[PDB]
Design a protein around this ligand. Structure first.
Ligand SMILES: [Ca+2]
Ligand SMILES: [Ca+2]
Lengths: 167, 167
């Protein structure tokens, strides 16, 4: 009698699926909070994700169904797909004499610097979100040129860009 | 006497370079707009890009220098690098019975649909900015699942995502 659970993303606001008609479907989140819904006469259920729950991707959700006689199904599992890009990274001021670009980004993201000629350089953010990207000494940055930085998570979601002007 | 022109991106707000000290540096845009700056005593110039001039990338800029006697240098040109992502796409409502997803995006951008299991489908926005993406026949859409759409230009700049919930 285990219910089905439709695929859940990090941007989802509800969890839906199929269960025995008019059963009580119970969704348990990693933080121990639960949310419930009642399946309709055709067995379709919807459970609203509480606003106090933030799913980022990778979480395991558990869903059970309980009939009017108190029999509860075995749990069904769903893993949350990460479709949410990181926030825009920060970028510390960059002078024309700088040898690296540093800043903060989502931990473990891939940070991509686009130089004003369109070439690129990358660095990996550490577990605290710090990144450092080396500027090759044959790349000449001049005052007034623009730099652009993005951060991309492991599932390929890329942040909005952050710009800074060379000093 | 030809001025140098530092690399310009679509996100820059100034054009900088070197020219004869105290000469008037003139920047000409493809639309015929001009902007001016004075090179300083060390030969450095900064010219603010007029706000009504939105450089998107690919534009050829022309930069000349004129001395106090009205003699104008040969031009130097610079090509603008596109570092600006398209706007977030629009997505028309998608029912669980839908066979395609449609909406609007930057013309000739690649629109990427991410299904709630993390798999994707792609389409190109046409000359009017309209896109249509076929839903693969092995993808089963269910009411309450989230769909996500992004748009990417030819230089790899990826829009903010747009979400919609399957009906
Ligand atoms: Ca993410
Ligand atoms: Ca662009």
């Amino acid at each position: 009698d285990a219910p089905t659970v439709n695929d859940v993303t990090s941007d989802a606001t509800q969890v839906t699926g199929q269960a025995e008609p008019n059963s009580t479907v119970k969704l348990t989140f990693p933080d121990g909070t639960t949310a419930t819904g009642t399946a309709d006469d055709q067995g379709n259920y919807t459970i609203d994700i509480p606003s106090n729950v933030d799913l980022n991707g990778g979480e395991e959700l558990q869903v059970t169904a309980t009939d009017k006689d108190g029999n509860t199904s075995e749990p069904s599992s769903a893993n949350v797909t990460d479709t949410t890009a990181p926030d825009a990274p920060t970028v510390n001021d960059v002078t024309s004499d700088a040898t690296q670009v540093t800043g903060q980004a989502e931990p473990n993201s891939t940070v991509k610097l686009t130089f004003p000629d369109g070439t690129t350089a990358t660095g990996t953010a550490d577990d605290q979100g710090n990144y450092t990207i080396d500027i090759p000494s044959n790349v000449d940055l001049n005052g007034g040129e623009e730099l652009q930085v993005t951060a991309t998570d492991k599932d390929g979601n890329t942040s909005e860009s952050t710009n800074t002007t060379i000093i």
